[PDB]
Design a protein around this ligand. Structure first.
Ligand SMILES: N[C@@H](CCCC[NH3+])C(=O)O
Ligand SMILES: N[C@@H](CCCC[NH3+])C(=O)O
Ligand SMILES: N[C@@H](CCCC[NH3+])C(=O)O
Lengths: 292, 292
């Protein structure tokens, strides 16, 4: 049952960088207890780039075991190599994950046709629901609406995460794919509209620090309650902007730490929120009420 | 020993997509015999994205072993995780490569400070020349001249592959670094210009199909022979264009196959040159004399 507020869960590390299993458990209880509908473990925010193939599935395994069915658990499995996406995706299934989120290829700029037979292959090679992921801002390629529609017809491809933040884009994708095809938001700031457009959720970074609030806003958004959604949103907006004052998840982790939920750990090349951006974020957290 | 025409060598595959050592052998004799200054193996064009770790060094070892050290062999080792880049850089050294090429981190968008810590650590961890590589059109990030200057003072960071195609940029970096840090072009179209400015070579893609002519061009350009370098360039210009009709190395492998040098094998998400581009590339090839 995959829709609503879906925290793009961070992967906590201790001061020396080793996975801190204690923080992960608490964070899972945290979202488990404050309304979160789903959890995306090992995604862009959970630092998928810098995890061992071994670390990858251990994080997917530990969350799945804790959640125990109460919520869906979506595993990040995209890769710029089809064979490597198969491996990760198969490793997520034989792990318990409820579904896989697969970003489009990143460095090597495939053709639209290539992205088609890329996801189509994985969807055929692994018997697990897969969710497309578009974010050209990171991966220097863009999966046009025509190609989304072709993939929507494929049997295991249940939905897509649209992160461009462009609302004419969601509109177009939504007006071409079935009622079965779930469109999710990957841009917190404009998620409310995507949902009012027919969107079925928001894979959020903001949910990491304001879980109860994000589920309320997705609820209202998907309920047709356009008044309430904005009301919350405009309250949360300053947090939406601050959390990206530096490439995500650098900021969201600083906050998580300032709340006392995770150690100060992050893997290279990533760095810790540089000095200059500390009060901008803290005021956003204080003004929004997630801190003190 | 590292400058001039530096073929960004393709990794030949058979029709099933396995390694074709026989084609690789030939290719090496081809650049070896036609004036190629240096060979870059397993880089962007060599489809680094879709090779095992075991394929990575095998290819390198083979090239190094054939070259018998008469020419420099540079291995692609960059990765979006500093631990992986260390590993990949260790494989290459303990593989005989004369130097390694390291593209900036790609999907994770590290801060300028992060990129410095990134390359500074690899330069420390592995005793082998390290060349940087900046190309935002793929990595969704860009390493500023200021950050190049910092990494330039690092003991075994010997140069940078500037691939923006922005000449004002190259001027800025040449103008900031010691006469011992070398700037190479990453854009075939404007390579002649970069060298004239003070650059020391082209990690060329064109050189894949026109080696002799490429090293003639780089030689002139590094001499100071402006008139001659730009004449050979406008003659090649339509080839520089055709080789990018679709994302590299799709177009180039085609040519390579049309010349009878490699089989028709490419790894997903990569596709074979789509039908519409066959005759534009065959003409540009024939129009330039690589083909007859
Ligand atoms: N096993 C790591 C691989 C990192 C390499 C990223 N291209 C992951 O979870 O993605
Ligand atoms: N202080 C380092 C973190 C090193 C820990 C190991 N990845 C940084 O933010 O760059
Ligand atoms: N697909 C892997 C390749 C690693 C092995 C060497 N090419 C990556 O991008 O991290």
């Amino acid at each position: 049952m995959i829709a609503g507020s879906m925290v793009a869960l961070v992967t906590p590390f201790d001061a020396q960088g080793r996975l801190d299993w204690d923080s992960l458990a608490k964070l899972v209880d945290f979202h488990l207890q404050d309304g979160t509908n789903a959890i995306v473990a090992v995604g862009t925010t959970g630092e998928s780039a810098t995890l061992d193939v071994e670390e990858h599935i251990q994080v997917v395994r530990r969350v799945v075991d804790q959640v125990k069915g109460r919520i869906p658990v979506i595993a990040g499995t995209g890769a710029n190599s089809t064979r490597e996406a198969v491996a990760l995706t198969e490793a997520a299934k034989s792990g318990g994950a409820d579904a896989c989120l697969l970003v489009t290829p990143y460095y090597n700029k495939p053709t639209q046709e290539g992205m088609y037979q890329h996801f189509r292959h994985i969807a055929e090679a692994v018997a697990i629901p897969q969710i497309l992921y578009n974010v050209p801002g990171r991966t220097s390629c863009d999966m046009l609406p025509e190609t989304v529609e072709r993939l929507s017809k494929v049997p295991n491809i249940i939905g897509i995460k649209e992160a461009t933040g462009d609302l004419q884009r969601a509109k177009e994708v939504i007006e071409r794919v079935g009622k079965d095809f779930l469109v999710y938001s990957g841009d917190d700031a404009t998620a409310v509209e995507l949902m009012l457009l027919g969107g079925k959720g928001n894979i959020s970074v903001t949910a990491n620090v304001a879980p109860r609030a994000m589920s309320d806003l997705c609820a209202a958004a998907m309920r047709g309650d356009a008044a309430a959604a904005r009301a919350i949103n405009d309250r949360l907006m300053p947090l939406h902007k601050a959390l990206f004052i530096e490439s995500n998840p650098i900021p969201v982790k600083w906050a998580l730490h300032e709340m006392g939920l995770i150690p100060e750990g992050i893997r290279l090349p990533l760095t810790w929120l540089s000095p200059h951006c500390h009060d901008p974020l803290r005021q956003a957290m204080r003004q929004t009420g997630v801190l003190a």
